[PDB]
Design an enzyme around this catalytic site. Sequence first.
Site, PDB file in Angstrom:
ATOM      1  N   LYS A 240       4.290 -28.512  -8.565  1.00 28.33           N
ATOM      2  CA  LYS A 240       3.455 -28.023  -7.448  1.00 28.33           C
ATOM      3  C   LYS A 240       4.171 -27.889  -6.121  1.00 28.33           C
ATOM      4  O   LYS A 240       3.770 -27.055  -5.344  1.00 28.33           O
ATOM      5  CB  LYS A 240       2.206 -28.890  -7.218  1.00 28.33           C
ATOM      6  CG  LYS A 240       1.179 -28.827  -8.378  1.00 28.33           C
ATOM      7  CD  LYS A 240       0.066 -29.902  -8.199  1.00 28.33           C
ATOM      8  CE  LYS A 240      -0.977 -29.727  -9.308  1.00 28.33           C
ATOM      9  NZ  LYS A 240      -0.601 -30.150 -10.699  1.00 28.33           N
TER      10      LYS A 240
ATOM     11  N   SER B 292       3.380 -32.480 -12.355  1.00 25.14           N
ATOM     12  CA  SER B 292       2.761 -32.015 -11.074  1.00 25.14           C
ATOM     13  C   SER B 292       3.730 -31.978  -9.892  1.00 25.14           C
ATOM     14  O   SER B 292       3.514 -31.281  -8.947  1.00 25.14           O
ATOM     15  CB  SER B 292       1.505 -32.809 -10.694  1.00 25.14           C
ATOM     16  OG  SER B 292       0.526 -32.726 -11.731  1.00 25.14           O
TER      17      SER B 292
ATOM     18  N   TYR C 285      -8.891 -32.417  -6.707  1.00 29.73           N
ATOM     19  CA  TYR C 285      -7.500 -32.146  -7.283  1.00 29.73           C
ATOM     20  C   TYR C 285      -7.522 -31.287  -8.579  1.00 29.73           C
ATOM     21  O   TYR C 285      -8.172 -31.675  -9.556  1.00 29.73           O
ATOM     22  CB  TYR C 285      -6.776 -33.494  -7.466  1.00 29.73           C
ATOM     23  CG  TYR C 285      -5.345 -33.375  -7.872  1.00 29.73           C
ATOM     24  CD1 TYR C 285      -4.459 -32.603  -7.138  1.00 29.73           C
ATOM     25  CD2 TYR C 285      -4.879 -33.994  -9.053  1.00 29.73           C
ATOM     26  CE1 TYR C 285      -3.112 -32.488  -7.539  1.00 29.73           C
ATOM     27  CE2 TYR C 285      -3.538 -33.880  -9.448  1.00 29.73           C
ATOM     28  CZ  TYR C 285      -2.650 -33.127  -8.685  1.00 29.73           C
ATOM     29  OH  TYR C 285      -1.319 -32.972  -9.107  1.00 29.73           O
TER      30      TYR C 285
ATOM     31  N   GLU D 118       1.846 -34.700  -0.267  1.00 38.32           N
ATOM     32  CA  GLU D 118       0.925 -35.611   0.346  1.00 38.32           C
ATOM     33  C   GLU D 118       1.638 -36.248   1.502  1.00 38.32           C
ATOM     34  O   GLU D 118       2.804 -36.680   1.393  1.00 38.32           O
ATOM     35  CB  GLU D 118       0.475 -36.663  -0.694  1.00 38.32           C
ATOM     36  CG  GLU D 118      -0.281 -35.980  -1.858  1.00 38.32           C
ATOM     37  CD  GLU D 118      -0.548 -36.879  -3.070  1.00 38.32           C
ATOM     38  OE1 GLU D 118      -0.207 -38.088  -3.003  1.00 38.32           O
ATOM     39  OE2 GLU D 118      -1.125 -36.329  -4.065  1.00 38.32           O
TER      40      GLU D 118
ATOM     41  N   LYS E  33       4.816 -37.336  -3.828  1.00 38.30           N
ATOM     42  CA  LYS E  33       4.100 -36.668  -4.894  1.00 38.30           C
ATOM     43  C   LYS E  33       4.499 -37.279  -6.247  1.00 38.30           C
ATOM     44  O   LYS E  33       5.697 -37.298  -6.555  1.00 38.30           O
ATOM     45  CB  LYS E  33       4.467 -35.192  -4.929  1.00 38.30           C
ATOM     46  CG  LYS E  33       3.638 -34.370  -5.915  1.00 38.30           C
ATOM     47  CD  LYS E  33       2.161 -34.303  -5.545  1.00 38.30           C
ATOM     48  CE  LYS E  33       1.322 -33.539  -6.534  1.00 38.30           C
ATOM     49  NZ  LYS E  33       0.714 -34.508  -7.470  1.00 38.30           N
ATOM     50  N   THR E  34       3.532 -37.792  -7.030  1.00 32.99           N
ATOM     51  CA  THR E  34       3.804 -38.173  -8.438  1.00 32.99           C
ATOM     52  C   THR E  34       3.598 -36.945  -9.314  1.00 32.99           C
ATOM     53  O   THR E  34       2.857 -36.013  -8.948  1.00 32.99           O
ATOM     54  CB  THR E  34       2.771 -39.227  -8.915  1.00 32.99           C
ATOM     55  OG1 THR E  34       1.439 -38.735  -8.675  1.00 32.99           O
ATOM     56  CG2 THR E  34       2.879 -40.445  -8.149  1.00 32.99           C
ATOM     57  N   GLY E  35       4.230 -36.954 -10.508  1.00 33.50           N
ATOM     58  CA  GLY E  35       4.051 -35.956 -11.511  1.00 33.50           C
ATOM     59  C   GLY E  35       4.094 -36.557 -12.931  1.00 33.50           C
ATOM     60  O   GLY E  35       4.725 -37.590 -13.170  1.00 33.50           O
ATOM     61  N   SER E  36       3.302 -35.984 -13.810  1.00 33.51           N
ATOM     62  CA  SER E  36       3.310 -36.357 -15.203  1.00 33.51           C
ATOM     63  C   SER E  36       3.086 -35.145 -16.096  1.00 33.51           C
ATOM     64  O   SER E  36       2.294 -34.229 -15.779  1.00 33.51           O
ATOM     65  CB  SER E  36       2.200 -37.386 -15.492  1.00 33.51           C
ATOM     66  OG  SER E  36       2.420 -38.655 -14.882  1.00 33.51           O
TER      67      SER E  36
HETATM   68  B1  LIG Z   1      -0.029 -33.988 -12.256  1.00 33.41           B
HETATM   69  O1  LIG Z   1      -0.687 -34.512 -11.050  1.00 33.41           O
HETATM   70  O2  LIG Z   1       1.200 -34.828 -12.582  1.00 33.41           O
HETATM   71  C1  LIG Z   1      -0.992 -33.615 -13.482  1.00 33.41           C
HETATM   72  N1  LIG Z   1      -0.356 -33.270 -14.731  1.00 33.41           N
HETATM   73  C2  LIG Z   1      -0.923 -32.448 -15.631  1.00 33.41           C
HETATM   74  O3  LIG Z   1      -2.080 -32.021 -15.540  1.00 33.41           O
HETATM   75  C3  LIG Z   1      -0.045 -32.026 -16.789  1.00 33.41           C
HETATM   76  C4  LIG Z   1      -0.519 -32.938 -17.945  1.00 33.41           C
HETATM   77  C5  LIG Z   1      -1.076 -32.636 -19.189  1.00 33.41           C
HETATM   78  C6  LIG Z   1      -1.416 -33.762 -19.968  1.00 33.41           C
HETATM   79  C7  LIG Z   1      -1.148 -34.985 -19.346  1.00 33.41           C
HETATM   80  S1  LIG Z   1      -0.456 -34.677 -17.796  1.00 33.41           S
HETATM   81  C8  LIG Z   1      -1.880 -34.801 -13.605  1.00 33.41           C
HETATM   82  C9  LIG Z   1      -1.338 -36.065 -13.861  1.00 33.41           C
HETATM   83  C10 LIG Z   1      -2.137 -37.206 -13.908  1.00 33.41           C
HETATM   84  C11 LIG Z   1      -1.511 -38.562 -14.215  1.00 33.41           C
HETATM   85  O4  LIG Z   1      -1.906 -39.581 -13.602  1.00 33.41           O
HETATM   86  O5  LIG Z   1      -0.605 -38.668 -15.082  1.00 33.41           O
HETATM   87  C12 LIG Z   1      -3.515 -37.076 -13.686  1.00 33.41           C
HETATM   88  C13 LIG Z   1      -4.069 -35.826 -13.385  1.00 33.41           C
HETATM   89  C14 LIG Z   1      -3.257 -34.692 -13.324  1.00 33.41           C
END
Ligand SMILES: *[B]([O])([O])[C]([N]C(=O)[C]C1=[C][C]=[C]S1)C1=[C]C(C([O])=O)=[C][C]=[C]1
Length: 354
Positions: free
Chosen positions: A63, A60, A146, A268, A308-311
């Site tokens: 973004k 993320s 979100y 943010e 901003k965090t991302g995963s």
């Molecule tokens: B983002 O905010 O980092 C977002 N990431 C994704 O939707 C891509 C992914 C697909 C599978 C797992 S992550 C996201 C991250 C998180 C989190 O806390 O890791 C939560 C909601 C959205």
Amino acid sequence: DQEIKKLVDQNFKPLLEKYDVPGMAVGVIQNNKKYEMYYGLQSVQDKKAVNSNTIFELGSVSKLFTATAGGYAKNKGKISFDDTPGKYWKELKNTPIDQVNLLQLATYTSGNLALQFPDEVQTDQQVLTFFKDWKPKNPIGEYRQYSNPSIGLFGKVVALSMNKPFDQVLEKTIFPALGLKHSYVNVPKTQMQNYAFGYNQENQPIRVNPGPLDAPAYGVKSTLPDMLSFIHANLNPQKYPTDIQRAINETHQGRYQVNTMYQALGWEEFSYPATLQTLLDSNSEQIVMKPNKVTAISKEPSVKMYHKTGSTSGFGTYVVFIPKENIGLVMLTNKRIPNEERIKAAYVVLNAIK
Ligand SMILES: *[B]([O])([O])[C]([N]C(=O)[C]C1=[C][C]=[C]S1)C1=[C]C(C([O])=O)=[C][C]=[C]1
């Protein structure tokens, strides 16, 4: 300064043992000087070390690049944030989604878009058809939920406005204007040997899968040097082309609030100094997973900080910067760790410096 390495070792290094993370890259930028701290392995099976060529998935944090691309398009007069997506995606005209404006999409206030598309939605046709059938639930603009599909649609509309597919907007216009040497939507053949494996909770090697509107929502890959350059541009944009300076500035303007969190474009925003718990609250279940009624900004903070965090399934990212202190931090891991841990370690480090 001879304490930056020491502080990162005290606060980030223990996290590799605690969560069995193979590889980490932590960067600090302070007073225009970059520090690069590397730990462990980009690939466990190849015994290959993390280094300045290592490519990680940003999740993320992608973004922020979508938001910048949109800022750039606004300032070349290709779009307006009061526009609706129907003006660029012809096939959405006069559907209920064509009452939502580009800002509202970018900032998650359509009133009926969920975190993720349904699993079943995959092709361009299924994506198109998803938005045609769309109908409101909350009053448009009133509720923040979100959402990947919300900012993803924004991203596709930005690309349309520039007559180029979204991956080419970033790879040919946006990344080059930021001076980035190794940031990708699609990692070319020549760099695959530098692309880290990610690692799931069962420590299996994985990389991100194709999905609908993936590029603008979570689909960029980058190195620590590049992400440190992105933070520099955010902290000190005067050196950058005018075009991209205006883009950056656009991404810093807070648009509404949810308690102590101000929502900007991608980033943010918080009043600086922020308490630790303020920073942790932005990644709370209440903020990330549930709808929350927004308010107009009442207190316009005089000194701001941004994060901003991302995963993805195999990767963690955190990025934070404070303009008034000319300091910023980037963390990249090739396994997810709890967001609260990323936030707290960065808090201790950035406070310790000054
Ligand atoms: B983002 O905010 O980092 C977002 N990431 C994704 O939707 C891509 C992914 C697909 C599978 C797992 S992550 C996201 C991250 C998180 C989190 O806390 O890791 C939560 C909601 C959205």
